[PDB]
Amino acid sequence: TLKAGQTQSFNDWFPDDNFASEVAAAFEMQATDTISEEQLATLTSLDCHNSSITDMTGIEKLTGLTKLICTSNNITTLDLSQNTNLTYLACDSNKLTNLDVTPLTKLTYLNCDTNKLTKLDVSQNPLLTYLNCARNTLTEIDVSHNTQLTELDCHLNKKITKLDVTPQTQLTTLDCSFNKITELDVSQNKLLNRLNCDTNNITKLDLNQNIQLTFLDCSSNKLTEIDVTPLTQLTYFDCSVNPLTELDVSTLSKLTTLHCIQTDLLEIDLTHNTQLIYFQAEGCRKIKELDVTHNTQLYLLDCQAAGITELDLSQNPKLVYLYLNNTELTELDVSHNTKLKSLSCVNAHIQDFSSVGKIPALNNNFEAEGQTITMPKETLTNNSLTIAVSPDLLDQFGNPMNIEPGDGGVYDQATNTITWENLSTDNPAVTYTFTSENGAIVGTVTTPFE
Ligand SMILES: [Cl-]
């Protein structure tokens, strides 16, 4: 017997006006048109995203539904106990404090991202392939019964301390970022391709079995060491904000992006990463040498704070963005880097900036303030001292710079010397600032005495 049931307006079926109105449009009808229980049951798919819906009461009557999208609404509860034919559920960006999916035994896609869930029970969903409980307030997530899971996103729950994916042998994408995870065993996830476990408390990460990762981000963790040598397919690798002291990327022939910001590395060998486009290594304070000569397609180089006294940029024609601020450089040469839109080398120990004027786009977009130069000491003669202003002090266009002595001292332009009167061994040095006429370059030259 196929019973018709009651026949009434969508507005009478669905108390929420905005919901009734969306269910109506699903049948290409108005909210005030009448429809039967048997008619309502024929709808296999519903999309009411971004509709100002607070209440989904009446959903129990749409029993033919295999797909429900209610994203970007104000829904505080969703009783889906009668919608047992659902295979796809997107209820993300709502105000759900709880969500029961235990009756939905045919469910293969579940997205409840950005809600207020404290528990989530997916143990009755054995066909699950996409679970996304991102941006909830969960403390754990048992996926032990969900063996067909290909993608898991439990990022930004904040309180997750344990994650077990040892049974998820089909996992290709994992995002467990911004939690308190301390151990991640990914050795059974042989098909893994994308891994993001950043912003956790992971101390060890064994990736030896995951030899077909293409994307890896283990940044902001507590990794003392890591072995990426087996991961020959990697194109993007990010291990920033870890206390790693040694990193071996020689096997990563396909690497395009390497981020190792704020790591403790003593050295780094980029010579085999011929395809490298982005190397971002700001705060790699222990590095004292950088050979980017084999990285011929480098588009952006950032090694701020690095202890490099020089940097051979001859082989990097494609460079558009270079960041050398806070380095130990005493020499700069960007003449072969004609694509540069932005150069920055604040707080270095540079004198001659003449190579930068070779690139006219840099005439304006150029910062080189806070230079700190240190000269060999002289002896006094009477209570006085004359010195030659360093000839290497040359600006962007190879012109002299303006000399402002740490004044008791008179700069003589003719002779390009400074003479201070009344100097004391109590205060054992003399200084002068230099500034370029465009104001892009500023520094000091300390000269000790006696
Ligand atoms: Cl009505």
Swiss-Prot record:
An MF annotation (GO) of this entry: signaling adaptor activity
Known regulation of activity: Despite being transcribed during bacterial growth in culture the protein is only detected in infected mice.
GO biological process terms on file: cell adhesion
Localisation: Secreted, Cell wall
Primary location: secreted
Induction: Expressed in late exponential phase.
LRR repeat spans: 42-63, 64-84, 85-105, 106-127, 128-148, 149-169, 170-191, 192-211, 212-232, 233-254, 264-273, 286-305, 307-316, 328-350
Keyword terms: Cell adhesion, Cell wall, Leucine-rich repeat, Peptidoglycan-anchor, Repeat, Secreted, Signal, Virulence
Single GO cellular component term: extracellular region
Domain of life: Bacteria
Chain's role: Involved in several steps of L.monocytogenes infection by both intravenous and oral infection. Probably acts as an adhesion; upon ectopic expression in L.innocula bacteria adhere better to human cell lines.
Oligomeric form and interacting partners: Nearly full-length mature protein and an internal LRR-containing fragment interact in vitro with human intestinal mucin-2 (MUC2) but not with mucin-1. LRR fragment binding is slightly better at pH 5.5, (the pH of the intestine) than at pH 7.4.
Protein name: Internalin J
Taxonomic source organism: Listeria monocytogenes serovar 1/2a (strain ATCC BAA-679 / EGD-e)
Residue numbers of the full-length protein present here: 53 to 502 of 851
